[PDB]
Amino acid sequence: PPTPHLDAIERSLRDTSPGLEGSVWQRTDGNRLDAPDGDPAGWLLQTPGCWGDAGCKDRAGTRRLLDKMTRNIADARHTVDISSLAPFPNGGFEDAVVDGLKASVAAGHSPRVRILVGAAPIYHLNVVPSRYRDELIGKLGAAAGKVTLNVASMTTSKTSLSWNHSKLLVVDGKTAITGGINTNKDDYLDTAHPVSDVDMALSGPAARSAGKYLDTLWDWTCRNASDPAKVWLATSNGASCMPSMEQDEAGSAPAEPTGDVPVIAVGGLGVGIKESDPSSGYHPDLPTAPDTKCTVGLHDNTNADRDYDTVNPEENALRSLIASARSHVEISQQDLNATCPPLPRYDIRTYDTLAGKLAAGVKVRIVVSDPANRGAVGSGGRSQIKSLDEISDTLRTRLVALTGDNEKASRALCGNLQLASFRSSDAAKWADGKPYALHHKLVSVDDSAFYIGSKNLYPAWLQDFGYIVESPAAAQQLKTELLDPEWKYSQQAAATPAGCP
Numbered sequence: 001p002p003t004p005h006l007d008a009i010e011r012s013l014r015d016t017s018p019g020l021e022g023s024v025w026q027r028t029d030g031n032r033l034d035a036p037d038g039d040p041a042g043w044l045l046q047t048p049g050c051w052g053d054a055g056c057k058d059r060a061g062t063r064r065l066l067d068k069m070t071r072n073i074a075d076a077r078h079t080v081d082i083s084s085l086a087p088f089p090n091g092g093f094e095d096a097v098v099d100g101l102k103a104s105v106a107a108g109h110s111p112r113v114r115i116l117v118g119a120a121p122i123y124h125l126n127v128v129p130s131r132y133r134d135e136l137i138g139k140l141g142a143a144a145g146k147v148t149l150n151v152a153s154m155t156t157s158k159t160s161l162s163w164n165h166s167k168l169l170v171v172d173g174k175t176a177i178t179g180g181i182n183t184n185k186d187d188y189l190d191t192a193h194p195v196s197d198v199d200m201a202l203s204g205p206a207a208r209s210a211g212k213y214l215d216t217l218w219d220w221t222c223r224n225a226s227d228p229a230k231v232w233l234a235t236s237n238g239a240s241c242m243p244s245m246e247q248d249e250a251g252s253a254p255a256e257p258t259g260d261v262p263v264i265a266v267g268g269l270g271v272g273i274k275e276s277d278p279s280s281g282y283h284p285d286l287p288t289a290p291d292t293k294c295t296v297g298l299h300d301n302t303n304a305d306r307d308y309d310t311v312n313p314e315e316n317a318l319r320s321l322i323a324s325a326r327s328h329v330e331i332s333q334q335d336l337n338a339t340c341p342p343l344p345r346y347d348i349r350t351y352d353t354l355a356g357k358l359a360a361g362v363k364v365r366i367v368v369s370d371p372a373n374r375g376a377v378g379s380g381g382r383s384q385i386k387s388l389d390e391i392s393d394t395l396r397t398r399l400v401a402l403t404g405d406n407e408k409a410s411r412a413l414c415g416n417l418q419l420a421s422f423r424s425s426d427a428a429k430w431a432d433g434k435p436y437a438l439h440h441k442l443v444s445v446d447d448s449a450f451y452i453g454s455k456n457l458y459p460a461w462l463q464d465f466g467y468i469v470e471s472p473a474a475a476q477q478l479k480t481e482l483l484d485p486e487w488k489y490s491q492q493a494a495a496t497p498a499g500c501p
Contacts, residue, residue, distance in 0.1 A: 003262050003449075003470045004324070005321065005324040005445055005446070005448055005449035005468075005470050006027065006262055006264055006449065006468065006470045008320055008323070008324045009264055009317055009320045009321055009324065009468060010027050010264065011320075012316050012317065012319075012320035013025050013264070013266065013313045013316065013317055013320075015280075015281075015282055016277075016280065016282050016309055016310055016313050016316045017277050017280060017282075017309075017310050017311070017313040018277065018279050018280055018281075019277040019278065019279035019280060020277055020310075020311065020313055022212065023212050023213065023215070023216050024213060024216055024266070024267050024268065024269060024311070024313055025209075025264065025265060025266040025267065025313045025314075025317070026206075026209040026212065026264070026265045026266075027262070027263070027264045027265075028204070028205035028206045028208075028209060028255070028262070028263055028264075028265070029205070029257070029260075029262050030204055030205055030256075030257025030258065030259065030260065030261075031202050031203065031204035031205060031206045031207075031257075031258060031259055031260075031261040031262070031263045032202060032203045032204050032258040032259025032260075032261060033200070033201070033202050033259070033261055033469070033471075033474055034175060034201040034202050034203045035201075036068075040477070041477040041480070041481050042064070043200055043201050043202065043474075044198070044200055044477060044478065044481055044482065045061070045064065045065045045068060045177070045179065045181075045198065045199040045200060045201060046061045046196075046197070046198050046199075046481070046482060047059075047061045047062045047065055047181060047188055047194065047195075047196070047197045047198075047199075048060075048061050048062045048188070048194045048196070049061020049062065049064065050424060050425070051424055051425070051485040051489070052424075052425050052426070052485070052488075052489070053425060054425040054426065054427035054430075054431070055431070056194070056430075059194065062188055062189065062194070065181065065199060066092050066093070066095075066096050068177065068201060069093070069096040069097075069100070069169055069177060070095075070096040070099050070100045071100070072100070072169060072171050072175050072177060072201070073096065073097060073099075073100025073101060073103075073104065073169070073171060074099070074100040074103035074104060074107075075100075075104070075171060075172075075175070076100065076101070076104040076109060076111045076171045076172055077104070077109050077111070077172055078109070078111060078112065078172050078249050079111060079112050079113075079114075079170075079171065079172055079173060079211075079245055079246065079249045080097075080100075080101065080104075080111050080112070080113045080114070080169075080170075080171055081113075081114050081168065081169070081170040081171070081173075081210075081211060081214045081245065081246060082097070082113070082114065082115045082116065082168065082169050082170075082183075083115075083116040083117070083118075083164055083166045083167065083168045083214060083217065083465075084116070084117050084118075084164075084166075084167050084168075084182055084183045084184075085117060085118050085163075085164070085165055085167070085182050085184070085378075086117040086118060086119040086120075086123060086125055086153060087117065087125065087126065087127060087184060088115060088117055088127060088129075088132040088151070088153075088183075089115070089183035090127075090183070090184070090185045091185030091186075091189045091190060092185070092189050093183035093184075093185070093189075094136075094139070094183075097136070098136065098139045098140060101113065101140060101143060101147055102140065102141075102143050105140075105143035105146045105147065106143070109146070110146040110147070110148070111146075111147055111148070112148040112150075112242060112245055113147055113148060113149050113150065114150045114152075114214065114218060114242060114245055115132075115149070115150070115151045115152070116152055116153075116154065116164055116214070116217060116218065116221065117152075117153050117154070117164065118153075118154055118155070118163030118164030118165055118166075118462065118463065119153050119154065119155055119163055120155070120161070120163060120377070120378065121155060121158045121161070122377070123378060125153055125232075128153065128232055129151040129152055129153055129232045129233060129234035130151075130232075130234040132151050132234070133149055133151045133234040133235075133236055136149065136151075137149075137236060144236070144237075145237065147236065147237075148235075148236065148237060148239045148242070149234075149235060149236035149237075149239070150218075150233070150234075150235050150239070150241055150242050150245075151233070151234045151235070152221050152225070152231060152232060152233045152234070153231070153232045154217075154221050154224075154230065154231050154232075155229075155230055155231075156220070156230065156269075156270055156271060156272030156273050156463065157270065157271040157272035157461070158229075159298070160270075160271035160272065160298065160299070160301065160461055161271075161298075161342070161343075161461060162270035162271040162272050162461045162462055162463070163270070163462060163463070164217060164270075164462065164463045165454055165455075165460070165462035165463060165464050166178070166213075166214075166217075166267060166454050166463055166464050166465035167179060167180065167181055167182060167183070167199075167454045167465075168210055168213075168214060168465060170207055170210045170211050170214060170246070171207075172249065173207055173208040173210075173211040173246050173249045173250055173255070174203055174204070174207050174208065174255070174256075174258075175201070175202070175203045175207050176201070176202055176203070176206065176207035176210040176211075176467075177199055177200070177201045178199060178200065178210065178452070178453055178454065178465060178466060178467060179197065179198050179199030179200055179441070179452050179453060179454065179466075180197045180198060180199070180334075180380075180439045180440055180441045180442075180453075180454060181197045181198075181199045181439075182380060184380075187379075187380050187381070187439075192430065192431075192432045192434075193430045193432040193434040193436075193437070195380050195381040195437045195438075195439045196381075196422060196424055196436065196437065196438050196439060196440070197380070197439040197440065198332075198440050198442055198452060198482065199452070200452045200467065200469075202261070202263070202467065203258040203259070204255065204256075204257060204258035204259060204261075204263075205254075205255035205256075205257065205263075206263040206265050206467060207255075208246070208250055208255040209263075209265035210265055210465065211245075211246030211247075211249070211250070212246055212247070212250075213265065213267045213465055214245075214246060215243065215244050215245065215246045215247055216269070216273075217273075217463060218241075218242065218243045218244075218245070219243040219244065220273045220274075221233070221241075221243075222241035222242070222243040223243070225241060230272075261469060261471050261474065262469075262470055262471070263467050263468065263469055263470075264317065264467070264468045265465070265466075265467055266313050266314045266317040266465070266466060266467075266468065267313070267314055267455075267463065267464055267465035267466070268311065268312030268313060268314040268315065268455070268462075268463060268464055268465075269311045269312060269463055270312070270461050270462050270463045270464075271301060271308065271461050273311070273463070274311045275307055275311070276306075276307035276308075276310045276311055277310035277311055280310040282306065282309060282310050283306070284306060284309070286303065286304055286305075286306065287303055287304075287348040287349060287352070289348065289398075289401055290348075291340070291344065291345050291346065291348070292397065293340075293345060294340040294341065294344070294345045295341070296340065296341055296342070296343065296344045297341045297342055298341070298342050298343070300344050301461045302315070302343075302344050302347050302348075302459040302461070303344055303347065303348045303349070303459075308461070312461075314453075314455045314464055314465070314466065315347070315455075317451075317468065318350070318443060318451060318455065318457060319347075319349050319350055319353055321443055321445060321449065321451055321468060322350065322353050322354065322357070322443060322445065323353050323356075323357075324445055324446075324449065325357055325362050325445040325446055326362070326446055327362065327363065327446045328362060328363035328364070328365070328445070328446060328447075329354075329357060329362065329363070329364050329365070329443065329444070329445050329446075330365045330367075330442075330443070330444045330445075330483050331364070331365065331366045331367070331442075331443055331457065332367045332422075332438070332440040332442040332443075332444075332482075332483070332486060333366070333367070333368050333369075333438070333440055333441060333442070333456060333457050333458070334368065334369045334380065334381065334382070334383070334437075334438055334439050334440065334441070334456060334458070335368055335369060335383060335384045335385065335456065335457075335458040336350075336366060336368055336385075336391055336457055336458055337384050337385050337390055337391065337394075337458055338384050338458040338459045338460065339377075339384045343458075343459045343460065344459045345459075346394060346458070346459065347457065347458070347459055350457060351394055351395065351398050352398050352401075352402070354395060354398075355395055355398035355399045355401075355402055355412075356402065357416075358395065358399060358412040358413060358416045358417055359399060359402055359403060359408075359412045361412075361415075361416060362416065363416055363418075364416055364417050364418070365417075365418040365419075365420075365487065366391060366417070366418070366419050366420075367419075367420050367421070367422050367438070367486055367487070367490050368383065368385070368388070368391070368420075368421065368422065368438065369381055369382065369383045369421070369422055369437050369438040369439070370383060370421035370422060370435045370436060370437070370438075370493065371383045371385050371386055371387055371388065371421065372421075372435040373435055373437045380437070380439040381437025381438060381439050382437070384458065388419055388420070388421065388495035389495070389497065389498065391419060391495075392413065392417065392419055392495060392497035392498070393497070393498070395413060395417065396409055396410075396413055396497065396498075396499070399412055399413055406499075410499045410500065413497055413499070413500065414497065414499065414500035414501060417497070418487070418491070418494065419494065419495045419497070420487075420490040420491055420492075420493050420494040420495060421490065421493040421495075422436055422437070422438035422486070422490050422493075423436055423489035423490045423492055423493050424436055424485075424486075424489055425489055426489065426492070428492075428493070441453055441454055441455055441456050441457070441466065442482075443457070444475060444478055444479070444483060446475075447472065447475045447476060447478075447479050448470060448471075448472050448475050449468060449469065449470040449471075449475065450468065450469055450474075450475055450478055451466050451467070451468045452466060452467060452469075453465055453466015453467060454466060
């Protein structure tokens with residue numbers, strides 16, 4: 001089957017990051033979207049799972065996620081690989097890890113386990129790696145002796161604000177769950193106003209790709225444990241750090257196919273792991289038109305650093321994904337814009353790509369977290385804009401840089417853009433009083449190809465990861481289970497840009 005969208009993205013990645021192919025990004029064939037029996041769209045893991053249910057009393061989506069995480073870990077024979085934003089997995093997420101590992105050990109196995117979290121310089125870790133390890137060992141009981149733990153918290157750049165933001169659970173290098181969902185008790189589980197989020201589950205070669213990505217992070221992490229300012233590390237049973245757990249598990253034989261889905265795994269190394277891809281001949285003309293509303297204090301890695309692109313293929317993968325749209329693009333995000341300063345307000349190439357689509361008559365929908373969501377720098381669901389106008393005005397500006405006419409700009413913008421704040425029911429706010437918050441990092445194109453992962457479209461220089469799938473069948477499921485419902489309710493909070501009927 002043809003894969004025109006993957007092909008274009010692959011061209012972009014091989015131009016940007018040829019040396020990172022097979023570690024930080026990889027295209028594979030023969031994957032399977034991992035859905036349970038009798039639930040074919042079940043590979044798509046939404047939380048809390050309450051479309052058109054303002055009460056959201058049951059939260060079946062959350063229960064399904066935790067259930068699936070537990071089952072995947074229960075099935076482990078050799079390796080369990082977990083990454084997240086700090087804190088270390090707690091509440092029901094930790095229960096899933098403990099229960100799964102206990103089952104694995106009960107089934108005769110001695111799993112190796114890596115648990116990696118990223119921490120901002122201003123973030124204080126309450127439960128540090130040694131204490132988290134001890135806590136797990138306690139919960140594991142007699143099984144602890146059979147489980148090899150590596151637990152670490154990391155920060156790769158203090159000045160360039162870089163640390164792990166990827167959200168992965170990879171088992172035996174053959175199943176993978178990834179997406180926007182942080183294993184954080186207080187965002188999804190113990191709360192009356194749960195954040196809306198999306199993960200996906202797959203099996204096959206692309207799971208190994210995810211594993212190879214975590215090996216790249218742990219190679220750095222293990223080496224830089226020599227600097228406690230950057231890395232805090234704790235192991236159990238006197239075990240060594242395990243930089244290449246996934247490669248050891250992979251061995252020499254190729255990953256076996258589990259289905260027929262083609263996938264590009266793609267991530268990024270942020271700042272402070274690797275300065276550039278030395279084999280890259282990537283040579284872009286980086287944007288000349290600077291944001292007329294803000295100036296970055298920090299060096300702009302998003303908009304003005306060639307080297308950063310070469311070790312962050314995910315940035316260009318998202319841009320080329322959007323650029324591959326021939327009919328329509330849906331963007332579902334926490335934010336399209338970042339708080340500026342210290343970060344650039346937006347990714348210029350992304351916005352220019354979008355403007356290009358609008359001008360060409362390609363339908364563009366952007367749904368973001370309601371600006372009413374003001375949280376601290378670290379929290380999921382918060383908004384980094386005061387009004388949806390900050391998105392449409394920027395598109396208008398870029399449209400004007402493109403068409404040379406503001407009337408031309410208006411016809412493109414007003415005729416082809418849908419722009420709204422996220423809603424999941426007819427209710428505007430939870431019974432909580434608090435507004436609905438969106439944590440998606442999702443892009444879907446032509447109901448054919450889509451990204452689900454941890455990489456936000458708003459500027460951030462973190463280590464992130466995600467999958468891009470090309471499958472009309474799978475994208476149909478995404479449309480039905482997530483995108484059509486999102487718009488059914490969110491259109492009630494749609495924006496009408498300035499200069500539009």
